[PDB]
Design a protein around this ligand. Structure first.
Ligand code: PD
Ligand code: PD
Ligand code: PD
Ligand code: PD
Ligand code: PD
Ligand code: PD
Ligand code: PD
Ligand code: PD
Ligand code: PD
Ligand code: PD
Ligand code: PD
Ligand code: PD
Ligand code: PD
Ligand code: PD
Ligand code: PD
Ligand code: PD
Ligand code: PD
Ligand code: PD
Ligand code: PD
Ligand code: PD
Ligand code: PD
Lengths: 178, 178, 178
């Protein structure tokens, strides 16, 4: 069954994108707004990736989900967030330990850290960064009027990892699968 | 008087933010416009910080003040500015020697370099950078309709270092003070 | 003829900007739009320079020209471009070998890589980077309603290297010339 072997090999080489020499690593930051809309920023880079952005509004950001590709080393993830005197602030937190595996068919398709913002916030500025396990970054942003639209028009056609409000997992298991 | 000791210790630990292991360093660039308004950009980072921005207008930028936190090593400050053939330009100036100490109660609360722009300028693009004495940067920007508003609504509630048009100094002395 | 010697010396020192200790290197990205307009982004930096930008529209970008100053080492040029599953994408291409010398009087005044976009594209996001042969970068952008305006109002008064739609070369030869 060479057809079957070829199918597995082809899918495996696609999971193998997580062991690239070129060290590809992606991060997505999702901002969940009070009108139900979702703003997404995606950066893809090599070796390390981070995003630094502010999310303003009278629909205000209510929650953040950060998702990293499975090539990230979770132990290197750092996050800083702001608008409490700066001069008594923590400069960052090492948030790795809070990231959960997003799994499909027992394969890790990404890592997620999700946190709600207190109602007192009309904004967050946020920087997050991670380095891959062992300049040319492209950034994408968009807004979707609902999480269902995000899922149908962005997550699903790109086969991206995701976790929705119901904690449903999205992504495609590839390692040695047909 | 343990209450007094505790007060001093608490304030000292706040000045000690200038000797952090984490190497926190801040820069503020103020742009003074012809209508009396003030635009501020603040970046806070670790180890080094720089800002690179252009200030356009029919109110035009008339002057620039750069302020660094007291953790900066003034000897590492570099600045580039533009709109004189590029191909005969200086790529940067090491401007450290022009920065004055902003002092409160004999304590350095920051370093300031201030320069007016010639009337021929309707714009400046500016990059400035400094490294601390021995990715995750958060940027903030705002505009205030007058320097008094800047002072009341930004400098004063944040206890930030500043120098106003009259050369009045702002900031809070903390090292071993109550 | 000391006047003649001085003229040559002065022009030569201007070509010598391509052998600076300070490692000045420039890149220009031109985006040619379907209405005949031209968008330009210029970054000048030291040692390495790159630009990462997206060009959106109902006039759409139709072609890209990347020009580097003659200080770039063409062997270090890398480019990434996007909107074909990310998870089966090449992260970059080393495009150096496609860059042609722009020449004036037998002197290299820059390097050009030009490519049209397929009609299927309403956008490109693009990152390009190069390192000089052996933080403080200033970026400029503008739009011109036609390539002739670009040439008269940007290329010509700045003595910049360029290649126009007819493959006509622009720039000024300086090495040991009057
Ligand atoms: Pd690596
Ligand atoms: Pd966007
Ligand atoms: Pd955006
Ligand atoms: Pd975007
Ligand atoms: Pd839809
Ligand atoms: Pd769709
Ligand atoms: Pd579920
Ligand atoms: Pd250090
Ligand atoms: Pd702003
Ligand atoms: Pd701003
Ligand atoms: Pd801002
Ligand atoms: Pd006020
Ligand atoms: Pd206020
Ligand atoms: Pd005073
Ligand atoms: Pd070098
Ligand atoms: Pd522009
Ligand atoms: Pd622009
Ligand atoms: Pd610009
Ligand atoms: Pd014209
Ligand atoms: Pd002109
Ligand atoms: Pd020609």
């Amino acid at each position: 069954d060479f057809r079957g072997r070829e199918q597995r090999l082809f899918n495996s080489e696609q999971y193998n994108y997580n062991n690239s020499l070129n060290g590809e690593v992606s991060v997505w930051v999702y901002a969940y707004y009070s009108d139900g809309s979702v703003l997404v920023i995606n950066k893809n880079s090599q070796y390390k990736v981070g995003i630094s952005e502010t999310f303003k509004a009278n629909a205000k950001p209510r929650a953040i989900q950060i998702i990293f590709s499975p090539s990230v080393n979770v132990r290197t993830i750092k996050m800083a967030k702001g608008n409490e005197y700066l001069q008594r602030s923590h400069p960052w937190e090492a948030t790795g330990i809070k990231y959960r595996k997003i799994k499909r068919d027992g394969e890790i398709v990404g890592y997620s850290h999700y946190f709600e913002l207190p109602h007192e916030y009309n904004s967050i500025s946020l920087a997050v960064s991670g380095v891959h396990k062992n300049d040319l970054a492209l950034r994408f942003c968009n807004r979707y009027w609902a999480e269902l639209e995000l899922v149908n028009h962005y997550i699903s056609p790109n086969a991206y990892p995701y976790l929705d409000i119901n904690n449903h997992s999205y992504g495609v298991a590839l390692s040695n699968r047909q």
